[PDB]
Design a protein around this ligand. Structure first.
Ligand code: GTP
Lengths: 919, 329
DNA sequence: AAGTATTGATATAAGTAATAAATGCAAATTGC
DNA sequence: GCAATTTGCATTTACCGACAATATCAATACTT
RNA sequence: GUAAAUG
């Protein structure tokens, strides 16, 4: 049976739709089975195996593993019920007069509801699952997550049980409940082990506990492991019965449930959150407030359209991939099977210590290469196994957003954001007529898949026409031939398109042909495009293809020419690195650097990327770090001299982020913070995207503190306790976050409009994918949505939003005492200190300012007069136009963000006629 | 006939790496008189002394001009200090060597094949009579080397294969307190346990007077440290400095098992032994509760345990039928 | 006055050492 | 003001000399 | 922490 071939064989769309409905009805049950969680089936299986073993009367431990687990569950249940009894006793009593008791009730409210029955399932499965989790075998696991993972699994059970009908659990509570439950499991975990006496060498039979607590020493720091007995190690290894409760995430088989709330959507029976919040309470609070208000309907529509497109696996490409994999040696991307690591020969101990350390570094290099190849082989094997399992089915991909808004799939193993193989093994499920333009668009897609996207459309089609013979030969013989697709920039997608085009050319009339291969439309340097659109800079807009034209300018080619000129003038002087690198600078070696410069990649990241692109050439094979850093310096000089309008906006955003991260609330900080003189900064940069999604930057100073648990004190960090913000992280992360939010907003608008028009839309950040027949309509939609997004002044709206949200805030700053303005501040403080009777401090000044705002904000007219009469530290600065010009005692300053950098003139509507803008 | 470097001469030195030296011939002669090193070593001529981190060399010069051993050895790596030593001690009968005492292969080379320094071997019954070691490890960072030598005492691999060798050790004042902690004291640790097991120590000298409150009074009165003020050491920024005498003694137990038991017990140094046995292995609490018939030991904390009690616990752990493999570590 | 509790420091092990030499990215940030 | 100084966009996967360290004790803080 | 992938 093969549903894809059945679908292709069905001639008419009416019975195609009927078959689709029948397939949906049939696969509903399979989807439910796939999403099933083993928190009840495991218990039923254990009970059944125990009963059958008892009925038989004779069994052995290997098949009695489930019997032992059933015994453990039976012995555990009374203890957890007793704990719930204690919980009810402490919680029910209304009196709240603690008598210095050692009893803890904070966890009790957490684990009261439902943990009386299903809980032993989770303790058993998790403790068994983490068998050699963090190299505790030296058998065993680190207690750090062992308590946390148990607690997290319990929380997920509460959340999973609610969808079938304290939103975020604290790390302290999760650690407490995990510790309690693991201790209870340790108490009654028993196993029989036979030993030999040392004195008499006689066999002994004696039961021993299964799980034992312990500690280990690593470089002078305790670790606190939790170990498992040898007999259980053998039985688990000899049976391979993991029986996990959380299934690995897989592509769906049914249309994903449409997004309605921030917690409802995605998988049918597994809950998901609209944002990939790294357990930050502020982001969750803001997202929930936005969802309750109901102003992200367009985001919901965009996500629904992104997730509604069905996929399937490409059998023809999968066969070639499987053949290469079964051969098992080095290929385009598959590293090949390295059976065993070869230990290099070592020099004798009599050799020099420098030679000995050289040998040690050689062995380290060999080990690193072996480990990298092992990891890549494991990833490829996982991906191939999933592809083989899902071949012939109707895939789906529910999508999710990170805290900026960019769209990612929910299945992290097999998706279209993977590598070249991952993208190649996927084709659209629906078949659409190629039409008059589909043949041209397929040829263009192949042409720019080989990497020749710097040439016009007619030249690309001419190149495809020139190489059609090699296309046909390659598709006829994927191997045992010229292997032409191997030379392509993206060989696997190139190979799939070669198959596609060959099948087209064998057909007499290409227009009647039904194609499935997606067609990639992408923009070049999306960050530069968005900066040009924001700043209205025509000089950059013409450089990055915003303005209509007939020849597509290449920013990468331009910067490559500049770097070549720099290396030429350096080689004229006579630098050896200049001589080496002068002629071998290409587009690719600076593509990543220039693309991610807008993204905020620093010098080290630039060196890493440029070395990554330099390595495959092997021209500098042994070590190219010095060449990498010199070349990054030159590339940075070129980028600086090239871009200025982008840099103005970047600097404005960064400096505003700094001023926000150095701010103090007027009202919250009035409470004493145990410091007085030095305040703590608790404000994070927050803004709203044009769609309506509120963004809260999570960068904060996270400090680990020991939390008290039954087993030990676990050294974890609880994010729920608010902490001072990381000003440097916020300043360095505001610009790229803003740009990526704009990218995601444009994605969602374009996806919503395309879905309304009826297209099949799949997007990977900048690139948007669609059938070859719908490329023109998608392009029109994209340009319209870009116009709608950038018609208004986004930077001006951002400044207005900042000034409206942060109206009643003050900043701290140091100013010279010699300033006459500072003298009046001391004059006001002298009266202020005397009235209170104690020394005046910054906290007292903030309290006075809040009192003034209390008089000003009062709707009563008589109250406003007193506010004007009351003069405070912030009252002095109401007349100073330029705070920077005025700026030795620390004094309060009002928070005033700089006015937006000058906006050039550019009618963004002009790109509607442009064709090389996004292609 | 060896000139002691002058305080001005030490003053010219720029790099000390954090190692505090002493420049008082009076204090050195008082310490030597207290030690009475001629009692154990009744041949001044037959003595062969190896020093580690000699530094300025005032102690070495005083020792040579007082005893005149057959060959005095100095093992230093610091460039400036080596230059100073060669400049000041040129033409002297003293021998200057440029090596690194941290590197294990240094002693193995020096004794085994080139044999620039050939020691002499002695039986383990009595104190060695030809080989003496004097060390200065006052640098704060290098306190781990002291524990390494303490373990080498038991392993009989570094230099104690020649016999039992007396060590004249300069130590940071905090490491002295860590090592010389009587049972029940707050500063007791596995370092103190291994010190008690392998050697008997007498705190010869200590600079800071206030520091003496951190030791045990009955041991202080018997030891009689030669107190000196803090201004007698050239680098005055560092913490106080102590000297100990390290005499290896005979012992009878399995070193690896004893190390494992002490290490896994003193992670919890205040929990009663009624419960901490479980950390050793699976069912260890039950097994040791069954085997031990003494209630006092069942209630004593590991910080109060003595070496005899630790050896008894090691013997019981060996007698355990289901003991896990310590060698996995 | 009686207390009790939350916070902060210090040690733990022992060859991925230390200290000074070395070197490089610079810059936005953190000590005095 | 001055010297040093420690990092620097998002998402996912695999692997490991090993990754969120823990026990205890005193000093400050709070409550009665 | 190491490596890789994507933008
Ligand atoms: O900088 C890291 C590193 O020292 C250590 N660490 C964390 N996870 C691992 C691991 O799997 N293997 C090794 N050898 N070391 C590890 O902890 C430090 C702190 O880690 P981060 O704060 O960067 O957080 P996270 O664990 O999420 O990092 P990563 O695993 O994603 O890189």
């Amino acid at each position: 049976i093969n549903f894809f071939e059945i679908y292709n064989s069905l001639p008419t769309l009416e019975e195609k739709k009927a078959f689709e409905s029948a397939l949906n009805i049939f696969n509903q049950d399979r989807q439910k089975v796939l999403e099933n969680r083993a928190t009840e089936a495991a218990r039923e299986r254990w009970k059944h195996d125990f009963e059958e073993a008892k009925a038989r009367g004779d069994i052995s431990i290997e098949k009695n593993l489930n019997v032992k687990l059933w015994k453990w569950y039976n012995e555990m249940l009374p203890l957890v019920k007793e704990e719930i009894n204690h919980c009810r006793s402490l919680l029910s009593e209304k009196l709240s007069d603690k008598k210095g008791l050692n009893k803890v009730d904070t966890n009790r409210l957490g684990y009261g509801p439902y943990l009386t029955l299903i809980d032993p399932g989770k303790m058993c499965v998790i403790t068994i699952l983490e068998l050699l989790k963090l190299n505790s075998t030296g058998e065993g696991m680190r207690t750090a997550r062992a308590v946390i993972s148990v607690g997290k699994a319990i929380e997920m059970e509460f959340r999973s049980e609610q969808v079938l009908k304290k939103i975020l659990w604290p790390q302290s509570i999760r650690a407490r409940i995990g510790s309690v439950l693991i201790s209870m499991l340790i108490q009654v975990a028993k196993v029989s082990v036979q030993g030999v006496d040392p004195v008499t060498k006689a066999k002994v039979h004696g039961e021993a506990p299964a799980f034992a607590h312990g500690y280990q020493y690593h470089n002078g720091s305790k670790l606190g492991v939790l170990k498992i007995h040898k007999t259980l190690i053998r039985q688990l290894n000899g049976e391979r019965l993991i029986a996990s409760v959380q299934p690995q995430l897989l592509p769906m088989l049914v249309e994903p449930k449409p997004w309605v709330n921030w917690r409802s959507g995605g998988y049918h029976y597994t809950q998901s959150t609209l944002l990939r919040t790294k357990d930050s309470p502020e982001q969750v609070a803001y997202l929930k407030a936005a969802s309750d208000n109901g102003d992200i309907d367009r985001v919901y529509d965009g996500l629904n359209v992104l997730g509604r497109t069905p996929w399937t696996v490409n059998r023809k490409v999968f066969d070639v991939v499987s053949q290469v994999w079964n051969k098992g040696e080095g290929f385009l991307d598959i590293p090949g099977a390295q059976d065993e690591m070869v230990l290099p020969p070592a020099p004798p101990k009599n050799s020099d210590p420098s030679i000995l350390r050289a040998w040690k570094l050689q062995v380290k290099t060999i080990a690193n290469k072996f480990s990298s190849d092992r990891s890549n082989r494991c990833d490829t094997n996982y991906k191939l196994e999933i592809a083989r399992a899902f071949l012939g089915e109707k895939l789906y991909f529910p999508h999710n957003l990170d805290f900026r808004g960019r769209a990612y799939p929910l299945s992290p193993h097999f998706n279209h954001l993977g590598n070249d193989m991952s993208r190649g093994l996927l084709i659209f499920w629906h078949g659409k007529k190629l039409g008059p333009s589909g043949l041209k668009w397929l040829k263009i897609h192949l042409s720019n898949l080989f990497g020749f996207d710097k040439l016009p459309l007619k030249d690309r089609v001419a190149f495809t026409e020139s190489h059609l013979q090699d296309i046909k030969d390659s598709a006829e013989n994927p191997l045992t031939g010229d292997r032409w697709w191997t030379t392509a920039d993206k060989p696997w997608q190139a190979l799939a398109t070669c198959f596609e085009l060959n099948e087209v050319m064998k057909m007499d009339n290409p227009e009647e042909f039904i194609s499935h291969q997606p067609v990639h439309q992408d923009g070049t340097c999306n960050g530069l495009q968005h900066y040009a659109a924001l700043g209205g800079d025509v000089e950059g807009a013409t450089q990055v293809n915003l303005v209509p034209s007939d020849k597509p300018q290449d920013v990468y080619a331009h910067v490559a020419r500049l770097v070549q000129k720099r290396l030429e003038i350096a080689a004229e002087k006579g630098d050896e690195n200049a001589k080496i690198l002068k002629d071998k600078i290409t587009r690719k070696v600076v593509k990543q650097t220039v693309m991610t410069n807008v993204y905020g990649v620093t010098y080290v990241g630039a060196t890493f990327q440029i070395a990554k692109q330099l390595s495959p050439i092997f021209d500098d094979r042994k070590e190219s770090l010095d060449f990498s850093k010199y070349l990054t310096k030159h590339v940075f000089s070129a980028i600086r001299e090239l871009f200025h309008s982008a840099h103005l906006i970047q600097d404005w955003l960064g400096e505003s982020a700094k001023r926000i991260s150095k701010s103090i609330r007027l009202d919250v900080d009035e409470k004493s913070f145990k410091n007085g003189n030095k305040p703590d900064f608790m404000s994070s940069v927050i803004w709203t995207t044009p769609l309506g999604l509120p963004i809260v930057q999570p960068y904060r100073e996270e400090s680990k503190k020991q939390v008290e648990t039954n087993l030990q004190t676990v050294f974890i960090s609880d994010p729920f306790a608010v902490n001072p913000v990381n000003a440097r992280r916020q300043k360095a992360g505001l610009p790229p976050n803003f740009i990526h939010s704009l990218d995601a907003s444009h994605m969602l608008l374009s996806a919503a409009e395309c879905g309304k028009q009826g297209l099949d839309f799949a997007s990977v950040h900048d690139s948007y994918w669609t059938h070859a027949s719908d490329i023109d309509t998608m392009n029109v939609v994209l340009r319209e949505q870009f116009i709608k997004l950038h018609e208004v002044d986004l930077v001006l709206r951002l400044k207005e939003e900042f000034d409206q949200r942060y109206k009643n805030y003050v900043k701290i700053g140091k100013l010279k005492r010699s300033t006459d303005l500072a003298q009046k501040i001391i004059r006001i403080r002298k009266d202020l200190s005397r009235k209170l009777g104690r020394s005046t401090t910054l906290a007292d000044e903030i309290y006075f300012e809040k009192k003034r705002q209390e008089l000003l904000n009062s709707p009563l007219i008589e109250d406003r007069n007193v506010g004007e009469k009351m003069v405070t530290t912030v009252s002095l600065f109401e007349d100073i136009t330029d705070l920077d010009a005025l700026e030795g005692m620390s004094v309060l300053l009002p928070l005033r963000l700089p006015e937006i950098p000058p906006k050039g003139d550019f009618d963004v509507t002009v790109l509607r006629n442009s064709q090389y803008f996004f292609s | 006939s060896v000139p002691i470097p002058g305080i001005k001469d030490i003053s010219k030195l720029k790099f000390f790496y954090g190692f505090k030296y002493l420049w008082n011939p009076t204090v050195y002669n008082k310490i030597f008189d207290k030690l009475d090193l001629t009692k154990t070593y009744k041949h001044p001529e037959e003595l062969k002394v190896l020093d580690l981190y000699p530094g300025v060399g005032i102690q070495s010069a005083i020792f040579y001009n007082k005893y005149c051993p057959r060959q005095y050895s100095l093992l230093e790596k610091r460039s400036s200090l080596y230059k100073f030593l060669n400049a000041k001690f040129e033409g002297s009968p003293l021998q200057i060597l440029k090596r690194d005492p941290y590197d294990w292969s240094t002693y193995s080379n020096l004794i085994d094949e080139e044999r620039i320094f050939v020691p002499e071997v002695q039986s383990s019954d009595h104190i060695n009579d030809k080989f003496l070691t004097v060390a200065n490890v006052t640098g704060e960072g290098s306190e781990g080397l002291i524990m390494q030598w303490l373990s080498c005492i038991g392993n009989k691999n570094w230099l104690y294969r020649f016999g039992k060798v007396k060590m004249l050790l300069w130590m940071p004042s905090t490491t002295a307190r860590k090592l010389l902690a009587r049972p029940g004291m707050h500063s007791r640790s596995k370092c103190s346990v291994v010190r008690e097991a392998f050697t008997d120590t007498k705190l010869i000298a200590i600079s800071d007077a206030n520091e003496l409150k951190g030791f045990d009074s009955q041991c202080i009165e018997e030891w009689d440290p030669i107190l000196f003020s803090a201004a007698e050491i050239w680098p005055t920024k560092g913490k106080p400095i102590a000297l100990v005498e390290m005499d290896p003694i005979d012992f009878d137990f399995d070193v690896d098992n004893w190390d494992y038991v002490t290490r896994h017990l003193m992670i919890l140094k205040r929990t009663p032994l009624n419960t901490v046995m479980d950390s050793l292995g699976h069912g260890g609490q039950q097994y040791f509760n069954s085997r031990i018939t003494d209630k006092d030991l069942l209630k004593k904390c590991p910080i109060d345990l003595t070496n005899d009690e630790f050896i008894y616990l090691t013997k019981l752990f060996m007698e355990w039928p289901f003991k896990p493999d310590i060698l996995m570590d």
